[PDB]
Scaffold this motif. Sequence first.
Motif, PDB file in Angstrom:
ATOM      1  N   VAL A 152       0.840  -1.194   0.000  1.00 13.61           N
ATOM      2  CA  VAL A 152       0.000   0.000   0.000  1.00 13.61           C
ATOM      3  C   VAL A 152       0.885   1.257   0.000  1.00 13.61           C
ATOM      4  N   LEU A 153       0.475   2.286  -0.741  1.00  8.88           N
ATOM      5  CA  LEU A 153       1.334   3.470  -0.976  1.00  8.88           C
ATOM      6  C   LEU A 153       1.581   4.603   0.031  1.00  8.88           C
ATOM      7  N   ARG A 154       2.693   4.508   0.759  1.00  7.25           N
ATOM      8  CA  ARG A 154       2.902   5.329   1.971  1.00  7.25           C
ATOM      9  C   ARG A 154       3.740   6.616   2.100  1.00  7.25           C
ATOM     10  N   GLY A 155       3.918   7.081   3.340  1.00  7.73           N
ATOM     11  CA  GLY A 155       4.660   8.291   3.618  1.00  7.73           C
ATOM     12  C   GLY A 155       6.028   8.275   2.962  1.00  7.73           C
ATOM     13  N   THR A 156       6.372   9.402   2.337  1.00  9.44           N
ATOM     14  CA  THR A 156       7.625   9.548   1.600  1.00  9.44           C
ATOM     15  C   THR A 156       8.716  10.189   2.491  1.00  9.44           C
ATOM     16  N   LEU A 157       9.840  10.549   1.872  1.00  8.58           N
ATOM     17  CA  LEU A 157      10.925  11.307   2.508  1.00  8.58           C
ATOM     18  C   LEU A 157      11.437  12.347   1.473  1.00  8.58           C
ATOM     19  N   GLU A 158      10.978  13.593   1.606  1.00  5.54           N
ATOM     20  CA  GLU A 158      11.121  14.613   0.543  1.00  5.54           C
ATOM     21  C   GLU A 158      12.472  15.332   0.554  1.00  5.54           C
ATOM     22  N   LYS A 169      18.302   8.492   7.273  1.00 10.01           N
ATOM     23  CA  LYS A 169      17.897   7.366   8.108  1.00 10.01           C
ATOM     24  C   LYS A 169      16.495   6.730   7.843  1.00 10.01           C
ATOM     25  N   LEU A 170      16.230   5.507   8.307  1.00  9.38           N
ATOM     26  CA  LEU A 170      14.854   4.975   8.377  1.00  9.38           C
ATOM     27  C   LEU A 170      14.536   4.588   9.830  1.00  9.38           C
ATOM     28  N   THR A 171      14.619   5.615  10.683  1.00  6.53           N
ATOM     29  CA  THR A 171      14.364   5.555  12.140  1.00  6.53           C
ATOM     30  C   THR A 171      13.827   4.369  12.966  1.00  6.53           C
ATOM     31  N   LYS A 228       7.795  12.638   7.880  1.00  7.97           N
ATOM     32  CA  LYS A 228       8.961  11.795   7.641  1.00  7.97           C
ATOM     33  C   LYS A 228       8.687  10.325   8.009  1.00  7.97           C
ATOM     34  N   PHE A 229       8.793   9.446   7.010  1.00 11.92           N
ATOM     35  CA  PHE A 229       8.672   7.996   7.211  1.00 11.92           C
ATOM     36  C   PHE A 229       9.805   7.496   8.112  1.00 11.92           C
ATOM     37  N   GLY A 230      10.963   8.151   8.008  1.00 10.46           N
ATOM     38  CA  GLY A 230      12.142   7.824   8.810  1.00 10.46           C
ATOM     39  C   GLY A 230      13.419   8.209   8.085  1.00 10.46           C
ATOM     40  N   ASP A 237      11.503  16.563 -10.342  1.00  9.24           N
ATOM     41  CA  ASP A 237      10.911  16.858  -9.040  1.00  9.24           C
ATOM     42  C   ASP A 237      12.040  17.087  -8.031  1.00  9.24           C
ATOM     43  N   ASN A 238      11.787  16.778  -6.758  1.00 14.52           N
ATOM     44  CA  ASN A 238      12.842  16.527  -5.766  1.00 14.52           C
ATOM     45  C   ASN A 238      12.347  15.660  -4.590  1.00 14.52           C
ATOM     46  N   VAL A 239      11.447  14.724  -4.903  1.00 17.00           N
ATOM     47  CA  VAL A 239      10.835  13.813  -3.930  1.00 17.00           C
ATOM     48  C   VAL A 239      10.450  12.518  -4.654  1.00 17.00           C
ATOM     49  N   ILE A 240      12.533  11.156  -4.124  1.00 16.05           N
ATOM     50  CA  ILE A 240      12.355  10.030  -3.217  1.00 16.05           C
ATOM     51  C   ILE A 240      10.870   9.822  -2.858  1.00 16.05           C
ATOM     52  N   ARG A 241      10.336   8.633  -3.155  1.00 18.63           N
ATOM     53  CA  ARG A 241       8.994   8.220  -2.703  1.00 18.63           C
ATOM     54  C   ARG A 241       8.969   6.715  -2.356  1.00 18.63           C
ATOM     55  N   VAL A 242       9.524   6.368  -1.188  1.00 16.55           N
ATOM     56  CA  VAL A 242       9.658   4.961  -0.755  1.00 16.55           C
ATOM     57  C   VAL A 242       8.341   4.493  -0.146  1.00 16.55           C
TER      58      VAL A 242
END
Lengths: 315, 55
Positions: A5-11, A43-45, A50-52, A304-309
Amino acid sequence: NEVLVLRGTLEGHNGWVTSLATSAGQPNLLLSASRDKTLISWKLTGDDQKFGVPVRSFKGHSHIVQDCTLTADGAYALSASWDKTLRLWDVATGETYQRFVGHKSDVMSVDIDKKASMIISGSRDKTIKVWTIKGQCLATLLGHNDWVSQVRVVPNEKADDDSVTIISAGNDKMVKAWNLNQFQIEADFIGHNSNINTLTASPDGTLIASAGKDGEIMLWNLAAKKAMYTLSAQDEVFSLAFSPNRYWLAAATATGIKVFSLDPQYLVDDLRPEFAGYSKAAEPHAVSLAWSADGQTLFAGYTDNVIRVWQVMTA
Amino acid sequence: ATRHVLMRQGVLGIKVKIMRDPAKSRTGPKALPDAVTIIEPKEEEPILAPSVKDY
């Protein structure tokens, strides 16, 4: 079943994300790539917001990054760029052990074998050149007539003899697999319809992918050297991705991600979500992808400038 | 150039202006700033199927 399922990114970067890298020894220790002359360490906290935690920029080249390969240990990040290098960064810190210089035209790559030693790098001078973990060449290979695009490591469970094998790429429309010790000759991929802009590798020593400016993804073996599963994906991939141990493909086709599924032969699950104020020819189309080293976390990257994990979870 | 002629009558001036072949030259430039010249790409042949060698 697997509803992905499509979640919080890290911009965070200002330019254009152009690789990204599976950490390859501390899978947190994300470590990301650039265009505007850095490498934002995320990081991925993990913990949600912030997803992490965007904890070291690393600055520059003078010019644009096309890569950022982690070591076999995974705390020493290897640069490239359009001003003819390397500059080995310390993931932990802000520093340049060894400027590796010498090329003429614009590095396109970078990769490191299973012990962290006899490194390689493509070019536009139309080579290749080994630079050991010093600014120094073993040698300077010349079998290609072209822009040789990308080269990969492969991660060997025939338990390694010791005279090993690596790979390559691509306007002559071919691959070629160079003993990483004394660059001998082994097979190539004939056929394709224009640019080989990538390839990938197996996570044991017997799998590979190349890919598209034509449409088709022409697949592997290396330990069969025989041409394989020939798909058909229209635009191009720029940006290929093995799961590490699932049998899932991931590559960013413009348009999908086409997960194709390299066992049977199916389309499981295409991610073109999320999207706001565009004229197509604005998608903000990818340029790097990866699978959590330990293999879930797809670290989906975009222009763009938004990584979308964007991980796969439950039905 | 100006080569002063000292007729009888009255005096002249002469003025010549050669132009040089950008090719025949080495002096710096090999063209004008204008001249944009183009290759007529390559003549390629399509696909086949797959196909590979062992060396």
